[PDB]
Each structure stands twice: as C-alpha cells, then as structure tokens.
Design a protein around this ligand. Structure first.
Ligand code: HAS
Ligand code: HEM
Ligand SMILES: CCCCCCCC/C=C/CCCCCCCC(=O)OC[C@H](O)CO
Ligand SMILES: CCCCCCCC/C=C\CCCCCCCC(=O)OC[C@H](O)CO
Ligand SMILES: CCCCCCCC/C=C\CCCCCCCC(=O)OC[C@H](O)CO
Ligand SMILES: CCCCCCCC/C=C\CCCCCCCC(=O)OC[C@H](O)CO
Ligand SMILES: CCCCCCCC/C=C\CCCCCCCC(=O)OC[C@H](O)CO
Ligand SMILES: CCCCCCCC/C=C\CCCCCCCC(=O)OC[C@H](O)CO
Ligand SMILES: CCCCCCCC/C=C\CCCCCCCC(=O)OC[C@H](O)CO
Ligand SMILES: CCCCCCCC/C=C\CCCCCCCC(=O)OC[C@H](O)CO
Ligand SMILES: CCCCCCCC/C=C\CCCCCCCC(=O)OC[C@H](O)CO
Ligand SMILES: CCCCCCCC/C=C\CCCCCCCC(=O)OC[C@H](O)CO
Ligand SMILES: CCCCCCCC/C=C\CCCCCCCC(=O)OC[C@H](O)CO
Ligand SMILES: CCCCCCCC/C=C\CCCCCCCC(=O)OC[C@H](O)CO
Ligand SMILES: CCCCCCCC/C=C\CCCCCCCC(=O)OC[C@H](O)CO
Ligand SMILES: CCCCCCCC/C=C\CCCCCCCC(=O)OC[C@H](O)CO
Ligand SMILES: CCCCCCCC/C=C\CCCCCCCC(=O)OC[C@H](O)CO
Ligand code: CUA
Ligand SMILES: [O-][O-]
Ligand SMILES: [Cu+2]
Lengths: 31, 166, 554
C-alpha cells in the first residue's frame, strides 16, 4: 500500500472536516 | 516493484476517490437540510424587483426612514433599508425580538454590503434592485451593520445599527 | 544567438515570463502594507513617500489585484501552456502569432496601467458597476485578456499539425493538458468579453448612460471563477509532468492526470453563482445547482492530491526513504524547484478546505466578503501558483537563457520560497481567523483602529506576516535580477532538455485514454453544460435589464 500517500489524504480529510464542521457550527450559532 | 507499486497506488486512489465523493455527497445532504430550516431565510429572494435609484429617496418606501418599519404580519415586520454612501437609513433600525424581520434593502449610488454582525445576514445591495432577506432576532440589543463590498473611499467607516428591543 | 534562431519560442516565452514577474513584483509591493493594514497598523504614509503617485489604500489594492491576480498569472499561463506542449511535441509554435500575443498583452497592460497609475480606475480587479473607471482601463484590460485567444489558436494549431503527422496516435500528456486547458479558457473567457463588449466599453466611452449591476456581475463570474483554474492548471502541468522528475521519481498515472484535466474542462465554467450567493434576483434553486456543481469541480483536485502525493512518495522511496515519514525526508529539499511547488501543495490543503466551505450555499453567509476569502485565495494563488512559478526560475530560466544558477543563488532561492510559504501560512491564519470575527475584506481598517477589538490576536499574525513577506519579496527581487542580469552564459543549458518525468509501469486503461482524447466531443459537452447552467438565468436577466448611472467615489 501507498502508506504516505494515504497519510497526506488523511490530513486533507481532517482539515476539510474540521473546516466544514467548524463553519457549520458557526452558521447555526448565528441562525 | 514498479508494476506492483502502480497497481497498489491505483487501487487505493480509487478508495480515496469513492470516500471523498461520499464526503462531498454528505455535505450536499447537510446543505440541503439548512435549506429546509428557518436559517435559510437569509438566502435572498431570487425574484427580480426593480426600482429607480435616482428617485428612491424622493418617492416610495425608502423616502421616509422613520416609516421604514411596517408590521406586515401578526408577528412580522418588513423593513425598508437604504444602503448608501456612506451609511444606512434608518439609523438605528428598531425591531422587536422574536419577530420575523423581512429586510428589503437597496442603494441609490453604488453597491454595498449589508452584513449584520453576530448573524447570518450577509447580502449584496445592488442599485436598481431590492435585496430581500429574512431573519428572526432571538437576543435583544445592538447589532452592528458592516458594509463589506468596496464602495469607494468611505468604505472602511460605513456602519449601521440594528437595535433589537426586549 | 544561434539557439534562438532554432528555437525562437524560447525568447517569446522568456518575454512572457519576465513581464509576468515584473507585474508580480510591482503588484506585490502593496502586499506588506495591506498585511500591516489587516494587522491594524497604518504604514500608508511611509508608502506615499516612496510612491507619491499612490493616492489611497484602494488604488493600491486595485494595482495589487490587477497586477498579481490578472496580469502575472495570465502571462505565466501563456508562457507555460504554450512552451511546454511545444517542447513535448518538438514542434515550432507559429512565431508570428506568438509575437502578436505578447505585444497584445504588453500593449493592453500599458494602456490599462495609465489610468490605474493616475487614479482614474480605482475600481477593484473586479470592477463591479456602477463604480466607473476610465475607458482605458476597460479597453486595455479587454485587449490584455484577448491576447489569450491567440494563445488558444496557437496550441490548437500545434495540436492539429501533430495529429496530421500522427493519425491514430493519442494526444501526448502535456499537449492534452494544454489543449483541454485552452479550450476550457475559451468558453470561460466569453462571459467577460460579453460583459466588456455589450456593457463596459459602450458605457465607459459614453455610448450609454447606465449598466445593469446584476447582469454585469453575472457575466463577470461566468469568466470569474474558471479564471482561477486558468491560473491553477499551468502550475498543475508542472506539478504533474515535471515535479515528479525533480523529486527523483516518476508520474504514477498518465490517465489519472488526463482525467483531472478533463474534469476541469467540463466542471470549471458552469459554477459561477458560487460568487453570487448573496445576490438578489438569482433564484435559490440555481444557487443550489451551482453549489453542487462546485462541490464536483473540487474532485479533480481531490484526485490531484492523491496522484501527486503518491508520485512524491514513490520518489522518496526510490531515494531510500524508509518508514511512514522517511519518504518525506528523502526528497530533494535542497532543490528550490522541488521545494517551491511542494510547499505550495501543503498550503493548498487548508486552501481547498476553505474553498469547499465557501461553495456550500448557506455556509457562504458566514464568510462572504470577510477577510476569510482573501485567506482562502492567498493559499491558492498567492502561494501554490506563485511558489510554483517561482521555483521554475531555477529550471526554466536556464533553459530559456543559457544563464546558470550559482550554488549561492540556489541557497537564496530556498530562503525566498520558505519565507514566502511561511509568510503566506502566517497570513492565512490571521485572515481566516479575522474573517470569522466579521472583519470585512477590501477595507482600510487601520484607519478605524477601534472598530474590530475582538480581532487583536489574528491582527498580530497579519503584522508578522507583513514583515516576513516584505523580506521574502525584497529577497525575491534581489535574486531575480541577480540571475536575470548575470554575467556567465552557458548555451549548453538552453539546449538541455526540459526535465519531463517518465510515467510508471505498467498497464493502463487504453480505452479511458482513448475516450478522453475525443476532445471535440468533450468541448461541446462542456459548452452544453454552460448553456444549461447559465442560459435560463441570463435570458431572464437580459429580458429585464435595469441600467443605472455610474459613480466615481474616490
Ligand atoms: C488558484 C486560485 C484559486 C483556486 C484553486 C481556488 C479553489 C477553490 N475555490 Fe476559490 N473560492 C470558492 C470556491 C473554491 C473551491 C471549492 C475551490 C476548490 O477547487 C478547492 C479544491 C482543492 C482541494 C480539495 C485540496 C486538494 C489538495 C491538494 C491538491 C494538495 C495535496 C498536497 C500534496 C500532494 C503535497 C504533499 C507532499 C508532502 C511533502 C507530504 C468560492 C465559493 O464557492 C468563492 C467565493 C466565496 C465568497 O463569499 O466570495 C471563492 C473565491 C476565491 C477568490 C476571490 C474572488 C473574489 O475576489 O471575489 C479567489 C481569487 C479564489 C481563488 C481560487 N479558488 N477563490
Ligand atoms: C508579499 C505577498 C503578498 C501579501 C503580503 C499580500 C497581502 C494581501 C492582503 C492582506 C490582502 C487583503 C487586502 C484587503 O482585503 O483589503 C490581499 C488581496 C489580494 N491579493 Fe495579495 N498579497 C501578496 C501577494 C499576492 C499574490 C502573489 C496574489 C496573486 C497571485 C495576490 C492576490 C490578491 C488579490 C486578488 C487580492 C484581492 C483584491 C481585491 O479584493 O480587490 N496576492 N493581499
Ligand atoms: C526573515 C524575516 C522574518 C521577519 C521576522 C522578524 C521578527 C519580527 C519582530 C521581531 C522583534 C519583535 C518586535 C516587537 C518590538 C516593537 C513592537 C511595538 O511595540 O510596536 C511599535 C508600534 O506600535 C508600531 O507602530
Ligand atoms: C497553515 C495555514 C492554515 C490556515 C488555517 C485557517 C484557520 C481556520 C481553521 C478552522 C476553522 C474552523 C471553524 C472554527 C469554529 C470555531 C467556533 C465553533 O466551533 O463554533 C461554535 C461557536 O459557538 C460559534 O459562535
Ligand atoms: C467522519 C468519518 C471519519 C473520518 C476519518 C478519516 C477517514 C479516512 C478517509 C479516507 C481513507 C481513504 C482510503 C480508503 C482505502 C480503500 C481500500 C482499498 O481500495 O484498498 C484496496 C486494496 O487492493 C486492498 O488490498
Ligand atoms: C457507511 C455508512 C453509511 C451511512 C452514512 C450516513 C452519514 C450521516 C452523516 C451525516 C448525516 C446528517 C444528519 C442531518 C441532520 C442535520 C441537522 C442538524 O445538524 O441540526 C442542527 C441544528 O440545530 C438544527 O436546526
Ligand atoms: C486557527 C484558527 C483559529 C480560529 C478561532 C475561531 C474563533 C472564532 C469563533 C467563533 C466566532 C463565531 C461567531 C459568533 C457570533 C456571536 C456574537 C453575538 O451573538 O453577539 C452579537 C449580539 O448583538 C449580542 O447582543
Ligand atoms: C504601438 C504599436 C507598435 C507595435 C510594435 C511592434 C513591434 C514588433 C516587433 C517584433 O517583436 O516582431 C519582429 C519583427 O519582425 C521585427 O524583428
Ligand atoms: C471594441 C467594441 C466596443 C463596443 C463599442 C461599440 C459597439 C457598437 C455599440 C453602438 C452603441 C449603441 C448604444 C445604443 O443604441 O444606445 C441606446 C440607448 O441605451 C437608448 O436610447
Ligand atoms: C484605439 C485607442 C483609443 C480609441 C479611442 C477611444 C476614445 C474614447 C473617448 C471617449 C471619452 O473619453 O468619453 C468620456 C465620456 O464622457 C464618459 O465619461
Ligand atoms: C448535476 C447538478 C445537480 C442537479 C441539481 C441538484 C439538486 C438541487 C435541486 C433543487 C434545490 C432546491 C432549492 C430550494 C431552496 C429555496 C429556499 C428558499 O426559497 O429560501 C428562502
Ligand atoms: C502558523 C503557521 C506558521 C508555521 C507554518 C508551518 C506549516 C508547515 C511548515 C513546514 C512544513 C514542513 C514539511 C516537511 C519539511 C521537510 C524538510 C525535511 O524533511 O528536511 C530534510 C533535510 O533537509 C535532510 O535532507
Ligand atoms: C498539511 C498542511 C497543514 C494542514 C493542517 C492545518 C489544518 C488546520 C485545521 C484546523 C486548525 C483550526 C484550529 C482549531 C480551531 C479552534 C476552535 C476554537 O477554539 O474556536 C473558538 C470556539 O468558539 C470555542 O471557544
Ligand atoms: C513562533 C515561531 C516563529 C515564527 C516564524 C518566524 C518566521 C520565519 C523564521 C525563519 C524561517 C526560515 C526557514 C528557512 C528554511 C530553509 O530555507 O531551509 C531549507 C531546508 O534545508 C530544506 O527545505
Ligand atoms: C505562528 C507564529 C507565532 C507568532 C506569534 C505568537 C502569537 C502571539 C499573539 C498573542 C496576542 C497578543 C495580543 O495582541 O493580545 C491580545 C489582547 O490585546 C489582550 O488584551
Ligand atoms: C528571528 C526569527 C524569529 C522571529 C520572528 C518573531 C516571532 C513571532 C512572534 C511575534 C511577532 C511579533 C510581530 C508583531 C509586533 C507588532 C506589534 C503590534 O502590532 O502589536 C499589537 C498589540 O496588540 C498592540 O496593542
Ligand atoms: C475550431 C474550434 C476548435 C474546437 C474543436 C476542437 C476539437 C477538434 O476539432 O478536434 C479535431 C482536430 O481538428 C483533429 O485532430
Ligand atoms: Cu458601502 Cu463599503
Ligand atoms: O474562485 O473560487
Ligand atoms: Cu469561484
């Protein structure tokens, strides 16, 4: 398996999830 | 080795591509949901509603700011806001808490922002058009309006005020 | 030079590169001051001593945006996406036409610059009506951009000339990239051309009293989004077809790369309402559609991320790296041309994460028109694209000029790249963070020093990033001219082959590649997708035009 390639996309998923879930929380706090 | 590395690389890339698509799909489901809540009120009405910027301070509902706030439902207020260089009329905007506020905002000069700080109200105000948006204030007090579309040299200091009464 | 006689395309490209970077440097002068502004620190007095023609924050913001985001990026795309395919094919691009395109650009830039430097066009690089600039700004912008139509003709010409000599061969990688690239650009360009010709130019010449703000904004963002993919794909051509070699490895999938690009040809243009989420007179159903279409166009990069990371890993393994981490340290970190793109990819992770946030219909109300947005796009274009173009100096300059890079010049290169990366990282934090605190973009906020008290913390990031980037920019200037105006000239450099990567073995999807090469057919699909996505809305807008008087408020 491409272990490193996957680590990269782990970080990328986590970054995306944190961003998106983050702003979702904010959107609703302001709703 | 290379033949193998390639096979494994391509197998797993397909894993990734399916999961990512999935996650994108879920976000779409989650956006959809917001569309079904009352929080979607801040999306503009996409109806065209054209006015004449050159006469809007002389005639119509933007002409007399002390009458900008009309009760249009048993728990509903429409508020006619002028965004202009460089400010908002009326100042303040006075609405009651708990009530659904339909904002109908326009401009006589150039484009402005109407960004109500602390809320999801964020709408571009284009001269010639009326922007319509809906919010219910849950908490009483003072919200700042921020202009967030560059509108000339007075941009950085163009602010307004919404007072939400108890 | 005999070399230029045999390869006159080296000289045209060199010209596109230098002008681009000049535009970059001049544009970028304004950045540190802007960074200090978003840190609540007013250094504009200082600037107006150095540059007395500068009348305001917003004139500088116009120059900054026009020069970095429009001029340098386009000059760069024209450089890379002509010369690369031309070298891959070993064919001569039409030299008459190539020079027509450079002078078009240069002429147009100079005409547009006159009113910009004279404070007659302080509209932003978005120039939304009814804010009304000098006719020369619109004319010269129009002629600058149209230069790309010539480019489009050139690479299509190369393409077909090749196919003729080579019937029943598939299109080679870089050239398939460049071709879908340029065809994508042609559809996308139509929006702005439309806007300039139907509206901006009549108006500004005085032929018609008003312009409809909504219709102009709609036509602007037709072009307005895929212009960023126009910016991006030149970098991606290098990241895919060159970087793998620089890193010590190979490109791990020709077809995966072709697919990324093809997806960009299809999905780059029908998405622009993601800039008009807060606009009136656009139906919410159409905003949802474009929102969904926007989440799709994020796929080619989600894809790119894996393909490229895997290529990087393969390189690091080739070069002895053991472990889950060791393939990273095994890479050529002393090579500026490797570091620059890779750092840019790193920042691209939070960049695209913010793009994805922006594209969600209702989530955009949280961040629209706040410092968040500049936060997103400095990761995307001021970092990944600029860093890529930067590190190509160390391979592509020698190739075009015969001018060697000293070991000393290489070390300065690393310093700039890193300092640019890091500075951009630090600024991205101050901006996103300030954005979440409701600080507006496009605002001289140091002039209202008590307006945003809750933003004290991120502000210190913006200040820091300001001084850090000032140093990086100074160093970039010194270095560029240190190499450009250098003494030595070894011609066996200009004759060296571009460092194109090999593709890894082995077997592949020949039918996929073959389907993807049906380019005429994909071109039309893409164009249908635009008519479908923009048609009905635009027919209503045009059927109910409400023009307004223009204003000068500076
Ligand atoms: C180059 C320039 C540009 C790119 C690229 C870009 C990408 C995106 N953008 Fe954006 N953006 C928006 C949507 C997105 C989304 C969905 C993406 C996506 O394409 C992102 C996809 C990318 C990913 C999902 C990440 C993949 C990661 C990669 C590829 C890196 C992996 C790293 C590796 C492999 C390295 C590892 C190596 C080792 C050493 C370990 C929206 C809304 O939907 C708005 C309007 C918001 C508003 O309110 O105005 C917007 C506005 C902007 C503006 C300002 C417009 C203005 O001035 O008014 C600019 C100029 C800009 C630039 C650019 N934009 N964008
Ligand atoms: C020394 C590096 C640079 C610094 C410190 C810097 C800083 C800034 C900051 C603070 C702003 C926000 C100002 C505001 O919202 O009012 C900005 C806007 C901008 N930047 Fe840069 N910048 C840099 C280089 C670049 C580069 C390389 C690009 C293009 C490739 C770029 C593209 C833009 C554009 C498009 C704008 C938005 C203009 C507008 O909204 O009208 N920046 N930059
Ligand atoms: C390689 C280049 C990277 C650049 C990294 C450079 C280090 C940043 C600052 C270090 C000293 C700390 C400075 C703090 C001292 C004075 C700050 C102050 O009090 O501000 C003055 C005034 O408010 C303003 O108008
Ligand atoms: C290397 C450079 C990278 C730059 C990185 C950019 C920084 C932004 C990161 C995450 C934002 C996540 C959203 C933040 C959510 C915080 C608040 C929250 O969780 O929301 C509930 C709150 O009650 C509402 O008022
Ligand atoms: C909220 C959800 C929690 C988020 C937490 C992070 C999730 C990680 C995401 C993607 C990993 C993608 C890689 C999936 C691997 C697919 C398996 C595969 O295709 O492997 C075939 C191979 O041949 C076998 O031998
Ligand atoms: C392999 C596994 C297959 C199954 C995968 C399923 C993924 C489910 C993820 C998210 C569901 C979204 C739930 C939608 C509910 C949203 C409501 C919400 O968040 O409401 C907050 C707010 O206060 C209200 O007004
Ligand atoms: C690395 C990145 C770190 C980033 C860290 C993120 C910090 C921002 C968090 C939340 C903002 C959410 C906005 C919530 C707004 C509430 C304000 C409010 O409700 O007050 C106004 C009202 O008028 C009172 O009367
Ligand atoms: C003003 C317009 C002048 C346009 C300037 C045209 C100069 C173009 C000359 C050029 O670069 O073309 C080669 C030409 O054949 C000679 O060497
Ligand atoms: C380079 C291309 C720039 C385009 C310039 C002129 C095109 C011809 C346009 C002719 C002007 C027609 C305007 C018109 O008919 O105006 C009617 C008015 O709005 C109601 O009375
Ligand atoms: C070819 C080069 C220039 C074309 C000539 C362009 C001449 C345009 C002059 C029209 C003009 O200056 O119109 C101002 C008008 O009053 C609006 O404010
Ligand atoms: C391939 C492209 C995808 C095809 C299309 C995807 C599905 C979207 C359809 C309808 C959204 C309905 C939007 C309704 C939101 C209106 C809310 C409103 O009016 O709020 C005030
Ligand atoms: C708040 C944000 C400011 C801080 C920004 C931090 C963001 C990420 C920074 C660096 C990435 C480094 C990635 C790995 C770098 C590799 C260098 C390496 O491994 O060095 C090998 C060495 O040269 C022997 O050959
Ligand atoms: C590979 C390149 C590097 C990519 C890696 C960078 C990704 C950044 C992700 C998250 C940072 C956000 C910081 C955490 C958010 C803080 C939330 C918070 O405390 O917000 C206030 C809230 O209201 C409670 O008080
Ligand atoms: C809190 C933390 C402090 C705030 C940040 C200070 C800013 C810059 C520090 C200088 C960083 C200079 C990095 C140079 C790295 C470099 O060029 O090294 C190449 C390496 O050998 C392989 O890439
Ligand atoms: C990544 C590089 C780290 C750079 C600087 C460290 C950040 C220190 C920032 C601390 C904020 C100090 C400040 O301004 O204080 C807030 C407010 O004034 C209280 O009363
Ligand atoms: C030598 C290489 C490493 C050194 C790099 C420095 C480390 C980063 C830490 C702080 C940056 C400080 C810069 C900010 C100083 C400006 C002062 C300022 O604006 O302070 C705001 C304060 O809140 C007024 O109320
Ligand atoms: C002419 C417009 C070009 C747009 C169509 C390009 C597709 C096309 O014609 O491809 C066939 C090629 O000419 C043979 O290989
Ligand atoms: Cu009104 Cu900015
Ligand atoms: O532009 O996203
Ligand atoms: Cu876009």
């Amino acid at each position: 398996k491409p272990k490193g390639a996957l680590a990269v996309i782990l970080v990328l998923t986590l970054t995306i999830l944190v961003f998106w879930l983050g702003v979702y929380a904010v959107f609703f706090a302001r709703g | 080795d290379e033949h193998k590395a390639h096979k494994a690389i391509l197998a797993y890339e397909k894993g990734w591509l399916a999961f990512s698509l999935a996650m994108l799909f879920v976000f779409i489901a989650l956006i959809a949901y917001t569309l079904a809540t009352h929080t979607a009120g801040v999306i503009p009405a996409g109806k065209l509603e054209r006015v004449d910027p050159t006469t809007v301070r002389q005639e119509g509902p933007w002409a007399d700011p002390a009458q900008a706030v009309v009760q249009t439902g048993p728990n509903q207020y429409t508020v006619y806001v002028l965004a202009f260089a460089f400010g908002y009329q009326p100042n303040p905007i006075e609405v009651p808490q708990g009530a659904e506020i339909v904002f109908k905002i326009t401009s006589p000069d150039v484009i402005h922002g109407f960004h109500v700080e602390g809320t999801n109200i964020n709408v571009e105000v284009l001269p010639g058009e009326v922007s319509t948006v809906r919010y219910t204030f849950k908490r009483p007090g003072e919200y700042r309006i921020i202009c967030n579309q560059y509108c000339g040299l007075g941009h950085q200091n163009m602010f307004g005020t919404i007072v939400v009464k108890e | 030079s005999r070399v230029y006689e045999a390869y006159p395309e080296k000289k045209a490209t060199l010209y596109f590169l230098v002008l681009g970077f000049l535009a970059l440097i001049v544009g970028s002068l304004f950045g540190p001051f802007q960074a200090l502004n978003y840190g609540n620190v007013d250094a504009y007095p200082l600037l107006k001593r150095l540059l007395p023609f500068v009348q305001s924050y917003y004139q500088g913001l116009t120059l900054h945006g026009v020069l970095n985001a429009i001029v340098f990026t386009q000059l760069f795309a024209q450089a890379i996406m002509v010369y690369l395919p031309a070298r891959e094919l070993n064919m001569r691009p039409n030299m008459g036409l190539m020079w027509l395109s450079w002078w078009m650009a240069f002429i147009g830039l100079v005409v547009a610059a006159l009113p910009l430097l004279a404070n007659e066009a302080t509209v932003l690089f978005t120039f939304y009506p009814p804010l009304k600039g000098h006719w020369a700004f619109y004319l010269g912008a129009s002629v600058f951009v149209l230069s790309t139509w010539v480019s489009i003709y050139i690479v299509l010409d190369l393409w077909r000339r090749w196919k003729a000599a080579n019937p029943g061969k598939v299109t080679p990688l870089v050239t398939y990239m460049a071709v879908v690239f340029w065809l994508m650009w042609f559809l996308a360009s139509l929006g702005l051309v439309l806007e300039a010709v139907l509206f901006l130019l009549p108006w500004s010449f005085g032929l018609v009293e008003g312009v409809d703000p909504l219709v102009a904004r709609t036509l602007f963002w037709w072009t307005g989004h895929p212009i960023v993919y126009f910016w991006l794909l030149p970098a991606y051509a290098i990241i895919y077809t060159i970087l793998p070699k620089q890193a010590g490895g190979k490109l791990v999938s020709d077809p995966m790369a072709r697919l990324a690009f093809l997806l960009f040809l299809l999905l780059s243009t029908p998405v622009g309402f993601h800039h008009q989420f807060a606009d009136p007179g656009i139906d919410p159903t159409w905003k949802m559609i474009h929102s969904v279409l926007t989440l799709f166009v994020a796929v080619p990069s989600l894809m790119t991320a894996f393909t490229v990371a895997a290529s990087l890993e393969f390189a690091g393994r080739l070069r002895g790296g053991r472990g889950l981490f060791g393939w990273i340290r095994a890479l050529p970190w002393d090579n500026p041309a490797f570091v620059a793109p890779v750092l840019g990819l790193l920042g691209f992770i939070p960049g695209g994460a913010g793009g994805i946030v922006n594209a969600s219909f209702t989530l955009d109300y949280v961040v629209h028109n706040t410092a968040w947005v500049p936060g997103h796009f400095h990761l995307q274009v001021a970092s990944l694209v600029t860093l890529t173009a930067m590190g190509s100096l160390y391979w592509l300059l020698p190739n075009l000029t015969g001018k060697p890079i000293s070991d000393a010049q290489r070390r300065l290169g690393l310093a700039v790249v890193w300092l640019w990366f890091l500075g951009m990282m630090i600024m991205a934090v101050g901006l996103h963070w300030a954005g979440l605190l409701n600080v507006p973009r496009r605002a001289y906020i140091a002039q209202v020093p008590d307006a945003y008290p809750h933003a004290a913390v991120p502000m210190v990031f913006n200040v820091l990033a300001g001084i850090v980037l000032l140093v990086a920019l100074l160093l970039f200037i010194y270095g560029l001219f240190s190499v450009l105006l250098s003494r030595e000239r070894k011609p066996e450099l200009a004759e060296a082959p571009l460092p194109f990567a090999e593709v890894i073995s082995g077997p592949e999807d020949r039918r996929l590649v073959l389907a993807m090469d049906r380019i005429g057919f994909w071109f039309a699909v893409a164009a249908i997708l635009v008519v479908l996505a923009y048609g009905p809305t635009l027919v209503q807008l045009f059927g109910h035009l409400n023009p307004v008087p223009g204003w000068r408020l500076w």
